[PDB]
Amino acid sequence: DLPKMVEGVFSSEIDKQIQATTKFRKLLSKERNPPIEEVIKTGVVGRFVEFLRSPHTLVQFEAAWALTNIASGSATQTQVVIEAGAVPIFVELLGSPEPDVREQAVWALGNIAGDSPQCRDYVLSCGALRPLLTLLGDSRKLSMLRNATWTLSNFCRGKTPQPDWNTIAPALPVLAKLVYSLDDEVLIDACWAISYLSDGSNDKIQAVIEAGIPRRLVELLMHASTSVQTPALRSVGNIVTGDDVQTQVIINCGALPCLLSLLSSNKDGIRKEACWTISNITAGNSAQIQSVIDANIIPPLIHLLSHADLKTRKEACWAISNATSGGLQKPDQIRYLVAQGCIKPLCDLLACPDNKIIQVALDGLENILKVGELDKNAASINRYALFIEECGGMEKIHDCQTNANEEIYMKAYNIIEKYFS
């Protein structure tokens, strides 16, 4: 009964303290509607934090568990725990001699850090990372590995703002190891954590590369579990947003055959993601476009330009359009894209409700044309302009002249003025 429990918590006797606190732990453990607020109203959160420094590990544990589940509630409920000064103590408890106390401290810090980026940063400010990274390297207990990895992902997670880089960066070596874990759940949280850190500028990508992480990520693209594949894919995608040499690391770890496979994944998200990743590889140099061609990725893409949802058609559009970048250096590539039937599905997208997509399809089609114009002058017509005319594409370019986006209509005009006078 609630007021007797309050009495127990404020008793100075360790056994009264422990019976009471356990009852609170159990009540905050309810599956449906834990009365977090009623508990908070009683005034005991301050006590639970005192209990965190008792020499009796059991009350440390029960207190930590109660606190963990208050911090599992709303932002204001979490803040009550933060206000009480629990976080610097939880960091001390990462060094407790008693493994369950350490684990519960890890768990509490996960929940607190998970409430928001500001909260995340607060926890990092209290020196949480280093002792967490240590537990991750030493512990053999699977539950602790699961918990500490998940909590590590919460330390990495968030963009408004992102964690300070030098502060969170030491996580990379530990994550490089956790992705070889034999546990699926560790694998998942590790991969998510990596995808948060790899989402950034090229220097951050570089740090991921030099931790040695790319090789195992690519291998995890083909993991049985879509829950593993998704964040591993996300991370590989992030990497190839880097420069050409950084992108080349991903090619050299054999990602292209995996990306070819992932195009046929049963999850829409993975397919869409796979296309986005490929588009950033075909945004690269001539040789990297050629890699995508030699991997037979182009036909599935061109197929996806017509099939599956619009978000998919959008990403495939970027991928194919990007691939038309080297008409000057290696025009053989465009002629290959044309021969695999890219023109007609590109023309279709000119009527896309998204203006960026219209521009991307228009760009691709201008590059297609310039090669046909080079083949024309070395022969007598531009056969690419002809196929664009008779497939109905010329009329769709014509309609782009009524588009208001300056980039779009001016681009559409010159194509008509140049290849369709």
Partner 1 sequence: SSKRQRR
Q: Does 276 bind partner 1 (CB under 8 A)?
A: yes
Q: Does 29 bind partner 1 (CB under 8 A)?
A: yes
The single residue among 24, 61, 90, 107 that binds partner 1, judged by CB under 8 A, is 107
Shortest distance, position 244 Cβ to partner 1, whole Å: 9
Q: Does 111 bind partner 1 (CB under 8 A)?
A: yes
Closest-CA residue to 70 (of 106, 44, 102): 44
Residues 6+ apart with CB under 8 A from 190: 149, 152, 153, 175, 178, 179, 181
Closer residue to partner 1, CB minimum distance, 29 or 118: 29
Q: Does 71 bind partner 1 (CB under 8 A)?
A: yes
Closer residue to partner 1, CB minimum distance, 318 or 384: 318
Closer residue to partner 1, CB minimum distance, 175 or 397: 175
Q: Does 324 bind partner 1 (CB under 8 A)?
A: no
Closer residue to partner 1, CB minimum distance, 47 or 234: 234
Q: Does 100 bind partner 1 (CB under 8 A)?
A: no
Closer residue to partner 1, CB minimum distance, 241 or 382: 241
Residues 6+ apart with CB under 8 A from 305: 313, 316, 317, 320, 342, 345, 346, 348, 349
Q: Does 90 bind partner 1 (CB under 8 A)?
A: no
DSSP for 76-107, written as a single string: HHHHHHHHTT-HHHHHHHTT-SSHHHHHHHHH
Size of the residue set binding partner 1 (CB under 8 A):
29
Which residue stretch of 29-37, 124-132, 180-188, 334-342 sits at the interface with partner 1 (rule: CB under 8 A)? 29-37
Shortest distance, position 49 Cβ to partner 1, whole Å: 18
SS (H, E, C) 320-351: HHHCCCCCCCCCHHHHHHHHCCCHHHHHHHHH
User: 272 to each of 6, 218, 223, 317, how far by Cα in Å?
Assistant: 54, 17, 18, 11
The single residue among 22, 72, 248, 382 that binds partner 1, judged by CB under 8 A, is 72
Closer residue to partner 1, CB minimum distance, 265 or 280: 280
Q: How far apart are CA 105 and CA 119, in angstroms?
A: 16
Which residue stretch of 94-102, 131-139, 238-246, 332-340 sits at the interface with partner 1 (rule: CB under 8 A)? 238-246
**Helices and strands (DSSP H and E) totals, the chain:** 29, 0
Q: For helices 355-377 and 406-419, what crossing angle results, to 10°?
A: 20
Per-residue x/- track, 112-131, partner 1 (CB under 8 A)? --xx----------------
Residues 6+ apart with CB under 8 A from 292: 256, 278, 281, 282, 298, 323
Closer residue to partner 1, CB minimum distance, 243 or 399: 243
Q: How far apart are CA 11 and CA 140, in angstroms?
A: 38
Closest-CA residue to 281 (of 313, 243, 330, 329): 243
The single residue among 48, 65, 384, 419 that binds partner 1, judged by CB under 8 A, is 65
Q: Does 238 bind partner 1 (CB under 8 A)?
A: yes
Q: Residues in the site for partner 1, rule: CB under 8 A? A: 29, 31, 34, 65, 68-69, 71-72, 104, 107, 110-111, 114-115, 150, 154, 157, 195, 199, 234, 237-238, 241-242, 276, 279-280, 283, 318
